[PDB]
């Protein structure tokens, strides 16, 4: 993984207009609606019966906020994602048992949410830069699996 200076500036400029908590809850709710097998980790969260129940569930919103907050802090370390997500990688493998294909699905749902939120500002080149970033984050979180 490698970004040009141009790609980096495009990622950072758009991320400055993101409400991390709102975007986090909308991407993580849409992950659970669109790919419902990812609900397997969240039986303790209550009502996930319909799309409206998922999107309105406060435990789903809390999880999204935690996950995007970590993603966000990762954007300050684009030159060292493997070193930044090393400990979280170990935790997702050894303790949480999350298949890393889930990270890839979240990445594509997040790109769809940014396009929905920014409309025409989310141009083809800006999408291409974010596609590299989410693949890089997913690769960094899968790195310590064994």
């Amino acid at each position: 993984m490698h970004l040009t200076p141009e790609e980096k500036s495009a990622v950072t400029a758009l991320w400055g207009k993101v409400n991390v908590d709102e975007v986090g809850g909308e991407a993580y709710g849409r992950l659970l609606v669109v790919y419902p097998w990812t609900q397997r980790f969240f039986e303790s969260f209550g009502d996930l019966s319909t799309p409206d129940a998922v999107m309105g569930n406060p435990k789903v919103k809390a999880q999204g906020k935690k996950v995007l907050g970590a993603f966000s802090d990762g954007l300050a370390h684009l030159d060292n994602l493997k070193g930044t997500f090393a400990t979280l990688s170990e935790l997702h493998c050894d303790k949480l048992h999350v298949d890393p294909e889930n990270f890839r699905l979240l990445g594509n749902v997040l790109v769809c949410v940014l396009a929905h939120h920014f409309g025409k500002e989310f141009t083809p080149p800006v999408q291409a830069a974010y596609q590299k970033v989410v693949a890089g984050v997913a690769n960094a979180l899968a790195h310590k699996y064994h």
Binding site: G29, C112, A115, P124, Q127, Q131
Partner: protein
């Protein structure tokens, strides 16, 4: 399998695409060529610069096919029969690439249909494009 509610969602969303289907089809291909450059290996004969007539024409033909599938959603295999033969016997695009274009069509729709792209509609569109992709690769072997 598409549920009755999925069919209703797709028909509503594609109806709001209306006359822009061909422009959106072209934008989805441009988005895929930039984000996933290995897909450019199937178009070495194309001028791939932004706004080329070849890319605009490909966009329009792919939109027309999707419009035919929405109108015949209960009979896709028969409606897309000639296209499933062409992709299996002549173009022979590896099946992984259908998931990359479907992703780029979903991004394109999200960016142009702010009111209509709800969680439930996103889910129905994703399933519909997976079913179209399944029909277009059904005769590969």
């Amino acid at each position: 399998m598409l549920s009755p509610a999925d069919k209703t969602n797709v028909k509503a969303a594609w109806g709001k695409v209306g006359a822009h289907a061909g422009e959106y089809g072209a934008e989805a291909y441009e988005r895929m060529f930039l984000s996933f450059p290995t897909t450019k290996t199937y178009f070495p004969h194309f001028d791939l610069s932004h706004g080329s007539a070849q890319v605009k024409g490909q966009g329009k033909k792919v939109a027309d096919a999707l419009t035919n599938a929405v109108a015949h959603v209960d009979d896709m295999p028969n409606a897309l029969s000639a296209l499933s033969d062409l992709h299996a016997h002549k173009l022979r695009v590896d099946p992984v690439n259908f998931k990359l274009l479907s992703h780029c069509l979903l991004v394109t729709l999200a960016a142009h249909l702010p009111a209509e792209f709800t969680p439930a509609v996103h889910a129905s569109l994703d399933k519909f494009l997976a079913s179209v992709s399944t029909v277009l690769t059904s005769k590969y072997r």
